[PDB]
Write a protein that binds this ligand. Structure first.
Ligand code: CLA
Ligand code: CLA
Ligand code: CLA
Ligand code: CLA
Ligand code: CLA
Ligand SMILES: CCCCCCCCCCCCCCCCCC(=O)OC[C@H](CO[C@@H]1O[C@H](CO)[C@H](O)[C@H](O)[C@H]1O)OC(=O)CCCCCCCCCCCCCCCCC
Ligand SMILES: CC1=C(/C=C/C(C)=C/C=C/C(C)=C/C=C/C=C(C)/C=C/C=C(C)/C=C/C2=C(C)CCCC2(C)C)C(C)(C)CCC1
Ligand SMILES: CC1=C(/C=C/C(C)=C/C=C/C(C)=C/C=C/C=C(C)/C=C/C=C(C)/C=C/C2=C(C)CCCC2(C)C)C(C)(C)CCC1
Ligand SMILES: [Ca+2]
Lengths: 50, 120
C-alpha cells in the first residue's frame, strides 16, 4: 500500500482530520512550551542576576 | 474589656494592647520609689532577613519575608523591675514571662528561615 513516508497523505483532502491533525500538533507544541518552562523553573537559580 | 470568647479565633489575642491618639502625656519617676513593669509586650510586624552577598562582597541589606507560620509571633506577660539609676536613668530587667516564640518565614527563593524570636 502506502510507503512509510507517505502515511500522512491520508489527509490531503479530508479537512476534518486535517484539522484534527494540526490540532494535535499545536497541542504538542503548546504542551512542550508549558513543560519546558517548568523544567527551567525547577533548575534556574535566581540568586544572582549579575 | 472583652472576655476570652470575645477574642477567640479573631487573632486579637496576638495583639499587644494600644493607647488612643490622646494619651501623649508623661509619667513621673519618684527616683525614691521602686518601680516595675507589670506587663511588657512585643508584637512583630515585619521580619527582615539580611541576604548573604554571595562570594562577591557587595554589602548586604535586609529583605522582607512572608510569615509561613501564623499569628503566634507576639511576646507577652514580660515582667521585671524598672530600677532607677544613680545618673537618673532607667533600666528594665526582665524576670519571667512568655519571652520567646519560634517563628518561621519564607524568602524569595522559597527558603524557610526559622528563628527563635526572643528577648530572654
Ligand atoms: C472568520 C471565521 C474563522 C476563524 C476566526 C478561523 C480561525 C481559525 N482557523 Mg479557520 N477556517 C474558516 C474560518 C475561520 N477560521 C473557514 C471558513 C474555513 C474553511 C472551511 C477554515 C479552515 C481552516 C482550516 C483548514 C484551519 C483553520 C485553522 C484555524 C485556526 C488557526 C490558528 C490556531 O490554530 O489557533 C490555535 C490557538 C488558539 C489561541 C486557540 C483558538 C481557539 C478558539 C479560541 C476556540 C474557538 C471555539 C469555537 C467554538 C470553535 C470555532 C473554531 C473556529 C472555526 C473559529 C484559527 C483559530 C487551522 C487550525 O484549526 O489549526 C488548529 C486550520 O488548519 N481554519
Ligand atoms: C511545513 C511543514 C511540513 C509539512 C506539513 C509537511 C507535510 C508533508 N510532507 Mg513534508 N517536508 C517538510 C516539511 C513539511 N512537510 C520539509 C522541511 C522537508 C524537507 C526536509 C519535507 C520533505 C518531505 C518529503 C521528502 C516528503 C514529504 C512528504 C510529505 C507529506 C506526507 C507526510 C508523510 O507521510 O510523512 C511520513 C512521516 C514519518 C512516518 C517519518 C518522520 C520521521 C522524521 C524524519 C523523524 C523526525 C521526527 C521529529 C519529531 C520531527 C521534529 C519536527 C521538527 C521540524 C521540529 C505531507 C503532506 C512526502 C510526500 O510528498 O509523499 C508523496 C514526501 O515524500 N515531505
Ligand atoms: C504531529 C504528530 C502526529 C500526528 C498528528 C499524526 C497523525 C496521524 N498519523 Mg502519525 N506519525 C507521527 C506523528 C504524528 N502522526 C510520527 C512521529 C510517526 C513516526 C515517524 C508517525 C507514524 C505514523 C504511521 C506509520 C501512521 C500514522 C498515521 C497517522 C494518522 C492516523 C492516526 C494513527 O493511527 O497514528 C499512528 C500513531 C503513531 C505512529 C503515534 C505513536 C508514536 C509516538 C512516537 C508515541 C509517543 C509516545 C510518548 C508520548 C513519547 C515517546 C516516549 C519516549 C520518550 C521513550 C494520523 C493522521 C497512520 C495513517 O493513517 O497512515 C495511512 C499510519 O499508518 N502515523
Ligand atoms: C514553526 C515551526 C515548526 C514547523 C514548521 C514544524 C513542522 C512540522 N512538525 Mg513540528 N514542532 C515544532 C515546530 C515546528 N514544527 C515545535 C516547537 C515542537 C515542539 C518541540 C514540534 C514538535 C513536533 C512533533 C512532536 C512532531 C512534529 C512534526 C512536524 C511535521 C509534521 C508534518 C509531516 O508529517 O512532516 C513529515 C516529517 C518531516 C518532513 C521531517 C522534517 C525533518 C526535520 C525538519 C528535521 C529534524 C528531524 C531530523 C531529520 C532527524 C532528527 C531526529 C531527532 C529525534 C534525533 C512538520 C514538518 C511531526 C513529525 O514530523 O512526524 C512525522 C511530529 O511528530 N513537530
Ligand atoms: C493564547 C494564546 C497564546 C499566548 C498569549 C502565548 C504567549 C506566549 N507564548 Mg505561546 N503558544 C500558543 C499560544 C499562545 N502563546 C500556542 C497555541 C502554541 C502552540 C502552537 C504556543 C507555543 C509556544 C511555544 C513553543 C513557545 C511559546 C512561548 C510563548 C511566550 C513568548 C511569546 C513569544 O515571544 O512569541 C513569539 C512570536 C512569534 C513566533 C512571531 C510570530 C510572527 C510570525 C513570524 C508571522 C507569521 C506570518 C504572518 C501570517 C504574515 C501576516 C502578518 C500581516 C500582519 C502582515 C508567550 C508568553 C515561548 C515561551 O517562552 O515558552 C513558554 C515558547 O517557546 N508559545
Ligand atoms: C504563591 C505561592 C508560591 C509557592 C512557592 C512554590 C513555587 C516554587 C518556585 C521555586 O522557586 O522553587 C524552588 C525549588 C527549590 O528546590 C528545593 O530547594 C530546597 C527547599 O527546601 C531543597 O533543597 C529541596 O530539596 C528542593 O531542592 O525549585 C524546585 O524544586 C522546583 C519548583 C518549581 C515547581 C513549580 C510549581 C508550580 C507548578 C504549576 C503548574 C501546574 C501545571
Ligand atoms: C488532557 C487534559 C489536561 C492535561 C493536559 C496535559 C497534562 C498535557 C501535557 C502535555 C505535555 C507534557 C506535552 C509535552 C510535549 C513535549 C514534546 C512535544 C517534545 C518534543 C521534543 C522533541 C521533538 C525533541 C526533539 C529533539 C531531540 C530529541 C534531540 C535532537 C534535537 C531535537 C530538538 C530535534 C488538563 C488537566 C489540563 C485538563 C484538560 C484535559
Ligand atoms: C481517563 C479519564 C479522563 C481523562 C482522559 C484524558 C483527558 C487523558 C489525557 C491524557 C494526556 C494529555 C496525557 C499526556 C501525556 C504526556 C506525556 C507522556 C508527556 C511527556 C513529556 C515529557 C517526557 C517531557 C520531557 C521534557 C523534559 C525531559 C525536560 C525538557 C522539556 C520537556 C518538558 C520536553 C476523563 C477526564 C475523560 C474522565 C474519566 C477518566
Ligand atoms: Ca540564603
Amino acid at each position: 500500500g502506502l510507503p512509510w513516508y507517505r502515511v500522512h497523505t491520508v489527509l490531503i483532502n479530508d479537512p476534518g482530520r486535517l484539522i484534527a491533525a494540526h490540532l494535535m500538533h499545536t497541542a504538542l507544541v503548546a504542551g512542550w512550551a508549558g513543560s519546558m518552562a517548568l523544567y527551567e523553573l525547577a533548575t534556574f537559580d535566581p540568586s544572582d542576576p549579575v | 474589656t472583652l472576655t476570652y470568647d470575645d477574642i477567640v479565633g479573631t487573632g486579637l489575642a496576638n495583639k499587644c494592647p494600644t493607647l488612643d491618639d490622646t494619651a501623649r502625656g508623661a509619667y513621673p519617676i519618684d527616683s525614691s520609689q521602686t518601680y516595675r513593669i507589670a506587663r511588657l509586650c512585643l508584637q512583630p510586624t515585619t521580619f527582615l532577613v539580611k541576604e548573604e552577598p554571595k562570594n562577591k562582597r557587595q554589602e548586604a541589606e535586609f529583605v522582607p519575608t512572608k510569615l509561613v507560620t501564623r499569628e503566634t509571633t507576639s511576646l507577652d506577660q514580660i515582667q521585671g523591675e524598672l530600677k532607677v539609676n544613680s545618673d537618673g536613668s532607667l533600666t528594665f530587667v526582665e524576670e519571667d514571662g512568655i519571652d520567646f516564640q519560634p517563628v518561621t518565614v519564607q524568602m524569595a527563593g522559597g527558603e524557610r528561615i526559622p528563628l527563635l524570636f526572643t528577648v530572654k
